[PDB]
Amino acid sequence: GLYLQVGAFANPDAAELLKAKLSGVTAAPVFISSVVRNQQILHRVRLGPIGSADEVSRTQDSIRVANLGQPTLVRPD
Numbered sequence: 001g002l003y004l005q006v007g008a009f010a011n012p013d014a015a016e017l018l019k020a021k022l023s024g025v026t027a028a029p030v031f032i033s034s035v036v037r038n039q040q041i042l043h044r045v046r047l048g049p050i051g052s053a054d055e056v057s058r059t060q061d062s063i064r065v066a067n068l069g070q071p072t073l074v075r076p077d
């Protein structure tokens with residue numbers, strides 16, 4: 001399973017909004033993974049698991065077309 005991260009936010013509404021928008025441009029599960037980092041809560045907007053490298057590439061393209069951020073491969077935490 002391959003995962004992308006599209007943004008990471010201190011504001012939870014910003015993370016939830018990005019999650020909602022991403023659900024309109026991919027069929028992969030979109031979720032928020034929140035962690036403590038640098039004494040703050042960081043809400044990381046991720047999607048996956050994606051079943052193939054080619055689908056990752058096309059999903060990255062769709063996210064860029066939608067102007068939603070810079071979709072980056074991540075290892076799930």
Ligand SMILES: CC(=O)N[C@H]1[C@H](O[C@H]2[C@H](O[C@H](C)C(=O)O)[C@@H](NC(C)=O)[C@@H]3OC[C@H]2O3)O[C@H](CO)[C@@H](O[C@@H]2O[C@H](CO)[C@@H](O[C@@H]3O[C@H](CO)[C@@H](O)[C@H](O)[C@H]3NC(C)=O)[C@H](O[C@H](C)C(=O)O)[C@H]2NC(C)=O)[C@@H]1O
Pocket residue numbers: 005006007008009010011014018042069070071072073074
């Ligand atoms: C793809 C991704 O997740 N990018 C985020 C980025 O990630 C790093 C990361 O490096 C490692 C993990 C590390 O830092 O240890 C790595 N990516 C991954 C996935 O691992 C890669 O190398 C560098 C970079 O990419 O982290 C930064 C924080 O350091 C995230 O930055 C956030 O960017 C968003 C989008 O620009 C900010 O939101 C915007 O804020 C402006 C005002 O500043 C508003 O006017 C905009 O409306 C708002 N956009 C949206 C869509 O809401 C975001 O700041 C806001 C204020 C927030 O935190 O709520 C900013 N977050 C932080 C914590 O700085 C980047 O998303």
